[PDB]
Ligand SMILES: O=C(O)c1ccc(-c2c(F)cccc2F)cc1
């Protein structure tokens with residue numbers, strides 16, 4: 001697994017489950033191409049987005065649909081989504097996000 | 112101001128000075144139109160981006176150029192930038208502070224919204 | 227001031243108002259002596275804790291009573307409080323801002339230190 | 342495992358390895374008793390601190406020796422340590438901390 005995603009809920013102290021995540025790669029023409037997507041699991045994780053063959057060097061955007069997550073909990077959140085944009089330049093990338101209605105934090109663990 | 116940005120540096124324990132910030136507003140045709148830009152001051156703050164008249168309802172993107180910040184200090188960071196996307200003024204005018212706390216492989220952002 | 231505390235609420239997107247804060251200083255005998263206390267204002271800030279004269283070198287503990295904050299709002303949070311422990315003024319006088327961003331099961335803290 | 346700890350490094354985007362962690366329980370007399378300790382692994386994790394038998398309801402303090410971690414990297418950090426103080430009131434508790442020289446963040450994931 002070259003790329004994983006993890007999402008936590010800072011209000012409830014739980015994984016953030018069933019959160020939609022879309023990944024994009026920047027194309028030559030400077031636009032974003034759909035690359036991979038999924039929903040976080042019961043553990044707040046999304047594995048199997050890509051393979052090491054397909055995950056070549058490039059600029060990637062990971063978009064986390066935080067607004068839907070909070071709306072489902074009856075909470076009016078601030079952000080439309082959380083985006084994480086980074087260059088992958090070669091082994092394993094974990095993109096983690098910790099969510100609150102008016103705040104989020106993200107870190108990369110690269111091993 | 113109705114829109115202020117504040118950026119802090121978690122490595123140095125200081126304001127993040129001279130960080131470029133670009134603000135965009137989503138246009139009728141669903142593209143991001145330039146709205147305002149600036150750089151953070153010696154206090155890590157950026158004021159004067161817009162007026163209450165021009166800051167109408169809409170979806171705004173605040174892009175904080177964190178990579179240029181860390182590279183100007185000679186560090187190779189993870190992220191290209193930090194983006195904060197939000198709907199503004201949809202229940203009348205509010206004042207927004209977007210705060211960001213930066214490290215080379217992590218950032219945090221919060222919003223303080225007052226009426 | 228040489229010591230200020232600022233607290234924000236990540237659930238409401240607001241300053242965290244009326245948060246109790248107790249500051250202690252490590253004594254010669256290795257126990258925590260009361261140094262100062264107060265509550266955050268409507269802006270989430272707490273000033274006037276100490277003077278540059280009284281804020282000598284030492285190890286300080288800033289305890290932010292986050293549990294009392296969340297319970298006063300009727301939420302059951304995880305932490306008892308948030309503690310920030312640091313050595314101060316060991317290379318001469320500095321001004322310290324301790325900032326905290328609060329959620330029921332998480333908090334973040336940073337320091338801004340200026341000369 | 343009723344209690345785990347995890348530590349990440351926000352500067353380098355890596356687990357924080359070989360970080361000393363001490364756990365304490367509040368005794369009747371309102372003092373802190375040593376309860377458990379260890380060093381984080383290569384994955385930045387500390388498992389096997391306690392058993393479900395021994396991890397009864399009570400107030401616990403988890404102290405993370407962040408100052409030594411940064412000092413070993415040639416970095417002068419702000420905090421003496423990071424402390425996480427909480428009541429355990431019954432299944433599984435993960436205490437995570439994300440570290441920078443002048444900042445740290447901590448969350449509890451309770452499942
Ligand atoms: O200067 C402020 O008002 C301020 C300082 C720091 C933070 C902050 C943050 F942006 C992320 C995480 C933790 C923080 F305290 C928020 C606001």
Ligand SMILES: O=C(O)c1ccc(-c2c(F)cccc2F)cc1
Nearest residue numbers: 096098105107437438439446448
């Ligand atoms: O268990 C993890 O992988 C994990 C836990 C917590 C965090 C995190 C974060 F993404 C931002 C702020 C504080 C945290 F502990 C990151 C990763």
